[PDB]
Amino acid sequence: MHHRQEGELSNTRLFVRPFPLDVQESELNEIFGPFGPMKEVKILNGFAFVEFEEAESAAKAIEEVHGKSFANQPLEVVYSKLPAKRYR
RNA sequence: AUCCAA
């Protein structure tokens, strides 16, 4: 498969889906926040990316938020594409 | 409703 869908995922950058078209960063901060200090959040059309300041925090938020109720259905949580690959 | 950032 092409590298657009393959590569090493970050232990801190989480993928979250499915989402409604009305999810908010304030919702995910209450769900994922109790798992450690968060680095960044971004909500999008069908998903969001929740990053942690620690790998153990994100790894726990997967093992705890994966399969939780949101928009009347169980969502999923797993590792997402690695951040900070941008040039410098 | 399934990968965007940096």
mmCIF file of C-alpha atoms (C1' of nucleotides) in Angstrom:
data_model
loop_
_atom_site.group_PDB
_atom_site.id
_atom_site.type_symbol
_atom_site.label_atom_id
_atom_site.label_comp_id
_atom_site.label_asym_id
_atom_site.label_seq_id
_atom_site.Cartn_x
_atom_site.Cartn_y
_atom_site.Cartn_z
ATOM 1 C CA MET A 1 0.000 0.000 0.000
ATOM 2 C CA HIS A 2 1.101 3.594 -0.715
ATOM 3 C CA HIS A 3 2.770 5.575 2.102
ATOM 4 C CA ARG A 4 -0.268 7.907 2.154
ATOM 5 C CA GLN A 5 -1.937 5.260 4.362
ATOM 6 C CA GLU A 6 1.127 3.501 5.838
ATOM 7 C CA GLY A 7 4.026 4.452 8.126
ATOM 8 C CA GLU A 8 5.013 4.614 11.798
ATOM 9 C CA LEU A 9 2.187 6.112 13.867
ATOM 10 C CA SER A 10 2.965 8.348 16.854
ATOM 11 C CA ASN A 11 2.319 6.974 20.339
ATOM 12 C CA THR A 12 0.834 10.388 21.260
ATOM 13 C CA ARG A 13 -1.126 11.440 18.137
ATOM 14 C CA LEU A 14 -4.486 9.607 18.319
ATOM 15 C CA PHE A 15 -7.092 8.990 15.583
ATOM 16 C CA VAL A 16 -10.745 9.198 16.650
ATOM 17 C CA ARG A 17 -13.735 8.129 14.543
ATOM 18 C CA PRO A 18 -16.468 7.932 13.540
ATOM 19 C CA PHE A 19 -17.570 11.443 14.475
ATOM 20 C CA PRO A 20 -20.733 13.498 13.924
ATOM 21 C CA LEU A 21 -20.612 16.788 12.007
ATOM 22 C CA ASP A 22 -21.063 18.644 15.324
ATOM 23 C CA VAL A 23 -18.304 17.200 17.578
ATOM 24 C CA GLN A 24 -16.205 19.847 19.362
ATOM 25 C CA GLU A 25 -12.697 19.993 20.842
ATOM 26 C CA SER A 26 -14.363 20.765 24.195
ATOM 27 C CA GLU A 27 -16.008 17.317 24.111
ATOM 28 C CA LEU A 28 -12.754 15.423 23.519
ATOM 29 C CA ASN A 29 -10.971 17.410 26.241
ATOM 30 C CA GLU A 30 -13.427 15.958 28.784
ATOM 31 C CA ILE A 31 -13.089 12.410 27.406
ATOM 32 C CA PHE A 32 -9.345 12.217 26.717
ATOM 33 C CA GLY A 33 -8.230 14.835 29.293
ATOM 34 C CA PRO A 34 -8.578 12.500 32.350
ATOM 35 C CA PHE A 35 -5.759 10.408 30.790
ATOM 36 C CA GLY A 36 -2.929 12.954 30.978
ATOM 37 C CA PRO A 37 -1.746 16.377 29.754
ATOM 38 C CA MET A 38 -2.854 16.903 26.147
ATOM 39 C CA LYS A 39 -0.539 18.416 23.525
ATOM 40 C CA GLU A 40 -3.001 19.428 20.793
ATOM 41 C CA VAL A 41 -6.523 18.770 19.480
ATOM 42 C CA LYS A 42 -8.083 19.217 16.039
ATOM 43 C CA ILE A 43 -11.644 18.284 15.005
ATOM 44 C CA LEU A 44 -12.527 17.478 11.365
ATOM 45 C CA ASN A 45 -15.303 16.175 9.115
ATOM 46 C CA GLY A 46 -15.577 12.578 10.361
ATOM 47 C CA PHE A 47 -12.534 12.465 12.676
ATOM 48 C CA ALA A 48 -10.281 14.285 15.136
ATOM 49 C CA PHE A 49 -6.615 14.159 16.138
ATOM 50 C CA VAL A 50 -5.836 14.207 19.860
ATOM 51 C CA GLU A 51 -2.153 14.464 20.746
ATOM 52 C CA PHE A 52 -0.660 13.869 24.213
ATOM 53 C CA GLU A 53 2.414 15.260 25.976
ATOM 54 C CA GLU A 54 3.233 11.662 27.007
ATOM 55 C CA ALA A 55 3.063 8.303 25.207
ATOM 56 C CA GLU A 56 1.684 6.542 28.301
ATOM 57 C CA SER A 57 -1.194 9.043 28.415
ATOM 58 C CA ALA A 58 -2.217 8.442 24.802
ATOM 59 C CA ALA A 59 -1.677 4.680 25.105
ATOM 60 C CA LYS A 60 -4.040 4.685 28.109
ATOM 61 C CA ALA A 61 -6.626 6.908 26.404
ATOM 62 C CA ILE A 62 -6.743 4.281 23.638
ATOM 63 C CA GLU A 63 -7.205 1.404 26.079
ATOM 64 C CA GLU A 64 -9.954 3.420 27.830
ATOM 65 C CA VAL A 65 -11.716 5.586 25.199
ATOM 66 C CA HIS A 66 -11.615 3.018 22.393
ATOM 67 C CA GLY A 67 -15.208 1.823 22.068
ATOM 68 C CA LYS A 68 -16.803 4.646 24.104
ATOM 69 C CA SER A 69 -20.217 6.109 23.265
ATOM 70 C CA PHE A 70 -20.399 9.303 21.191
ATOM 71 C CA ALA A 71 -23.165 10.419 18.798
ATOM 72 C CA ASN A 72 -25.236 7.388 19.924
ATOM 73 C CA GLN A 73 -22.592 4.885 18.722
ATOM 74 C CA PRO A 74 -19.273 3.371 19.883
ATOM 75 C CA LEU A 75 -16.252 5.285 18.542
ATOM 76 C CA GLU A 76 -12.705 3.978 18.044
ATOM 77 C CA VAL A 77 -9.328 5.204 19.282
ATOM 78 C CA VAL A 78 -5.917 4.154 17.914
ATOM 79 C CA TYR A 79 -2.571 5.675 16.900
ATOM 80 C CA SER A 80 -2.510 8.177 14.019
ATOM 81 C CA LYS A 81 0.112 9.506 11.590
ATOM 82 C CA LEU A 82 3.247 10.951 13.179
ATOM 83 C CA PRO A 83 3.258 14.755 13.779
ATOM 84 C CA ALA A 84 6.078 17.258 13.330
ATOM 85 C CA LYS A 85 7.388 15.678 10.086
ATOM 86 C CA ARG A 86 7.226 19.214 8.618
ATOM 87 C CA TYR A 87 10.418 20.914 7.391
ATOM 88 C CA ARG A 88 12.576 23.080 9.683
ATOM 89 C "C1'" A B 1 -19.070 9.072 8.290
ATOM 90 C "C1'" U B 2 -11.705 6.462 8.864
ATOM 91 C "C1'" C B 3 -5.805 10.351 9.048
ATOM 92 C "C1'" C B 4 -4.859 16.344 9.855
ATOM 93 C "C1'" A B 5 -2.112 18.338 11.092
ATOM 94 C "C1'" A B 6 3.293 19.798 12.190
#
